[PDB]
């Protein structure tokens, strides 16, 4: 069988798979009790994409489609209904076995970005404006082929024209903005169940914690230092998808290595469904060089006890 491998990109050479951001730090939290079930950055070790995961770093939390009309909403500002397609421009089929169009945001909050338009036919007219998408809204129904966004701009948004959403950060993290990186949106709105979800992930063993690739996400306004934690960086998703190496056990042993010294800093388990666990006598951001990288060392199993970081 083809040998399993990981990229040799260092931490300062990786990007988040759940929002377009560089990886800032490695992170654990033994106090977090949320069910961890993100839908972007989901890929098995033998290369099967899951959830809403797609390959383009430009596709993460992106939308493509057309505005249907201006609408009324409880939120402050001007509101617009938008039909969404697949990111490649083909019509979205709600009957396909995906939770939502690939790239759809996988967390509750107010996503801040830019809505830009280029009119259909040269010299077509263009406009772009700041916009917010509230993924907790009952009007957030990407699996049904429709979402809603709001602008500070009151009138200059065209209907029936190609429309792009470029994500930039969060609008707010105040209580009424409902930011929770581990609460999934309801992809089909009220009274519906999410479908074809990538499974939740957890350590099998007591005394192991999930290890995250953490990025700090920008804010339009307000107070705070919000972060987005992903299970694997986008470059691992791209690498695994291409390689598609058979997984020879349920868990791969990986070592975090300092390329300068050649020595191992700590070790971790990379599980088959695509996430890391570690044994750690500390919490929060991991103190380690950003030029370190994960090296695959062997296929192990539940009998391999991890050394504390």
């Amino acid at each position, epitope marked *: 069988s083809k040998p399993f491998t990981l990229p040799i990109l260092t931490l300062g050479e990786l990007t988040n798979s759940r929002f377009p951001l560089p990886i800032d730090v490695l992170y654990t939290n033994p106090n977090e009790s949320a069910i961890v079930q993100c839908q972007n950055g989901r890929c098995t070790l033998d290369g099967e994409l899951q959830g809403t995961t797609q390959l383009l770093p430009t596709g993460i939390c992106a939308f493509r489609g057309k505005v249907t009309q201006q609408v009324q909403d409880e939120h402050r500002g001007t509101h617009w209904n938008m039909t969404v397609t697949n990111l490649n421009g083909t019509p979205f089929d709600p009957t396909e076995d995906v939770p939502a169009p690939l790239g759809t945001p996988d967390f509750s909050g107010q996503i801040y970005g830019v809505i830009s338009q280029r009119n259909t036919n040269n010299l077509p007219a263009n406009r772009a404006h700041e916009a917010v998408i509230a993924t907790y809204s009952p009007k957030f129904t990407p699996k049904l082929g429709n979402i809603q966004f709001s602008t500070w701009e009151t009138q200059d948004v065209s209907s029936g024209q190609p429309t792009k959403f470029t994500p930039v950060g969060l609008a707010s993290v105040d209580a009424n903005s409902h930011f929770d990186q581990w609460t999934l949106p309801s992809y089909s709105g009220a009274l519906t169940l999410n479908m074809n979800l990538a499974p939740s992930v957890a350590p099998v063993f007591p005394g192991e914690c999930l290890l995250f690739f953490r990025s700090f996400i920008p804010l339009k306004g307000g107070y705070g230092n919000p972060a987005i934690d992903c299970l694997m960086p986008q470059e691992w998703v791209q690498h695994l998808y291409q390689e598609s190496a058979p997984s020879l056990s349920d868990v791969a042993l990986v070592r975090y290595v300092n390329p300068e010294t050649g020595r191992t800093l700590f070790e971790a388990k990379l599980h088959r469904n695509g996430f890391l666990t570690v044994a750690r006598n500390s919490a929060g951001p991991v103190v380690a060089p950003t030029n370190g990288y994960f090296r695959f060392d062997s296929w*192990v199993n539940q009998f391999y006890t991890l050394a504390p970081m």
Partner: nanobody
């Protein structure tokens, strides 16, 4: 194709101590787990203590530190202390061979009787 040589068994009076040694040869690996299991008549074979190639230990949550395992690559020692008649059993050495290119492989020793 990992060969395991065990030693240090036999008869011991209660409160006595013995040290079992297991050594591996043949197709040993850089990354491995080594340890001891034991089985008494009528019971399932249960973990006693294991240790990995970088020294990480796991103990049966009943020995309460009365036993110690330690490592000379591909070699482990089980120090058996304050021994009781209930510790009379057949003790098995276990080696788990891990590789980047094959699924894990288990090897067991022939077993050494310890009679307290």
């Amino acid at each position: 194709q990992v060969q395991l040589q065990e030693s240090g068994g036999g008869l011991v009076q209660p409160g006595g101590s013995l040290r079992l040694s297991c050594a591996a040869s043949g197709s040993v690996s850089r990354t491995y787990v080594m340890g001891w299991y034991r089985q008494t008549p009528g019971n399932q074979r249960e973990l006693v203590a294991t240790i990995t190639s970088v020294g990480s230990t796991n103990y049966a949550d009943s020995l309460k530190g009365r036993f110690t395992i330690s490592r000379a690559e591909n070699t482990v020692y089980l120090q058996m202390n304050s021994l009781k008649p209930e510790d009379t059993a057949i003790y098995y050495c276990k080696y788990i061979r891990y590789s980047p290119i094959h699924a894990p492989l288990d090897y067991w020793g022939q077993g050494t009787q310890v009679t307290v």
